[PDB]
Structure formats: C-alpha cells, structure tokens
Amino acid sequence: MPTKPPYPREAYIVTIEKGKPGQTVTWYQLRADHPKPDSLISEHPTAQEAMDAKKRYEDPDKELEHHHHHH
Incomplete structure (x- = not known):
C-alpha cells in the first residue's frame, strides 16, 4: 500500500550570503x-549538510508533524 x-x-x-556588507560568507x-x-x-x-537535511525532510524518517486536530 504505497x-x-x-x-x-x-x-x-x-x-x-551573510556577515559584513563587504566581507560576506557563503551559507x-x-x-x-x-x-x-x-x-x-x-x-x-x-552544501553537503543542506543535501543531507533535504533527505531528512523527504525520507520517511520525518513523520507527519501536523498537530492532531489543532492540538
């Protein structure tokens, strides 16, 4: 049953980019x-942490986090 x-x-x-207007850092x-x-x-x-986190969102490990009946 999929x-x-x-x-x-x-x-x-x-x-x-973050940090100083002249000295920016990559995020x-x-x-x-x-x-x-x-x-x-x-x-x-x-970049790797972003790709990995993307999997954490899309993989079945991230369960339905919608609060049951607004509870």
Whole structure:
C-alpha cells in the first residue's frame, strides 16, 4: 500500500550570503515548496549538510508533524 499525494514531500537548497556588507560568507538554506516556498527548515554553511537535511525532510524518517486536530 504505497500512496503519492497531489502535493509530494519535496524540498530544495538556496545559496545565500551573510556577515559584513563587504566581507560576506557563503551559507545554504534548506527550503521546501511544501507547505510554503518561504518555509525555511534549517541553515548550514556547507552544501553537503543542506543535501543531507533535504533527505531528512523527504525520507520517511520525518513523520507527519501536523498537530492532531489543532492540538
């Protein structure tokens, strides 16, 4: 019994810069189209942590975290 919803659990990575206006540092933000494309999950200074975190969001290990009946 497998099931694929009309809106699958998919995420992506966004490369940003932080720090001083002249001296910037490279950062990676994990964001997902679900439930909203502005939903930031986690931030990491390395690409690998972003890809790994992306798997943590898309793998069955991340359970349905929607609060039961608004509880």
